[PDB]
Specification:
monomer, mainly alpha, EC 3.2.1.17, beta-N-acetylglucosaminidase activity, Lysozyme, three-stranded antiparallel β-sheet, 4 helices
């Protein structure tokens, strides 16, 4: 599925991301925009044997199990396939786990590079929430 920004904002809010651990909703929408262009199927296969999965491009070394990645920790306790669902349940819960394990949003390279320090509220402006 390719989300729209406001549709994604509303789904992320229903899953509790608005101000989760100090990150206002626009941060999460901005991260998704630049990680995957809102595509739940986005899959980026790296040369270290890991892969980044789904709308938030969560990586298979620490976070989800794909059975092909060296050093696997599976800290979200999910198959990476769950991160490719059209419904964002697994991706949101795993994003929460990343932060609950002491990582900022700085875990998402696209957030660091496209979102941190900008007017991220613009990503939810004019959305029904």
């Amino acid at each position: 599925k390719v989300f729209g920004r406001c549709e994604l904002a509303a789904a992320m809010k229903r899953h509790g991301l608005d101000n989760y651990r100090g990150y206002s909703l626009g941060n999460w929408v901005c991260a998704a925009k630049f990680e995957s262009n809102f595509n739940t199927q986005a899959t980026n296969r790296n040369t270290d044997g890991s892969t980044d999965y789904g709308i938030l491009q969560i990586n298979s070394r620490w976070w989800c199990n794909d059975g092909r990645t060296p050093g696997s920790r599976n800290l979200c306790n999910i198959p990476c396939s769950a991160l490719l669902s059209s419904d964002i349940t697994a991706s949101v819960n795993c994003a929460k786990k990343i932060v609950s394990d002491g990582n900022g949003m700085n875990a998402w390279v696209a957030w660091r590079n496209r979102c941190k320090g900008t007017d991220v509220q613009a990503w939810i402006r004019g959305c029904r929430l």
